[PDB]
C-alpha cells in the first residue's frame, strides 16, 4: 500500500479540540488557495463542533 | 493553564513521514498567506527530512 496521501491534524490547545482530516494533495499542499482552504477547512471543522452543538453559536 | 494555541500536524502517507507544528493562530488560520505558509512550512519541513539539508526558512 503505497499511495500519495496526506493527513493534516489540527487541534486547539485553547479549547483542546482536536480535528484530523485525510487529504491527498501533492503540490496542492504548497498551494495557498488549497492550504488556506485546508487550514480553514480544519478550523471550520473544529469550530463546527463548537457551533450547533454544545451551546449555540454566538462568539463566532 | 489557559493559553491560546493550535497544533497542526502534517503526515505524508506517501512517505510515511510525519511532522507536527505548534502555532498560535486565531484568525490567521483562516488567512491563506498564513495557512499557505503553515501548510507549505509543514510540508517544507516534512520534505526537509528528505533533503540532506535540514535548513528550512521559518523565521530566524
Curated annotation (Swiss-Prot), chains A, B:
InterPro entries: YoaG, YoaG_sf. Signal peptide: none annotated. Disulfide bonds: none annotated. It comes from the Bacteria. Pfam families: DUF1869. SUPFAM superfamilies: Hypothetical protein YoaG. Homodimer. This is Protein YoaG. It comes from Escherichia coli (strain K12).
Amino acid at each position: 500500500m503505497g499511495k500519495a496521501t496526506y493527513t493534516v491534524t489540527v487541534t486547539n490547545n485553547s479549547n483542546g479540540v482536536s480535528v484530523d482530516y485525510e487529504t491527498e494533495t501533492p503540490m496542492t499542499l504548497l498551494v495557498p488557495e488549497v492550504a488556506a482552504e485546508v487550514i480553514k477547512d480544519l478550523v471550520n471543522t473544529v469550530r463546527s463542533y463548537d457551533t450547533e452543538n454544545e451551546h449555540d453559536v454566538c462568539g463566532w
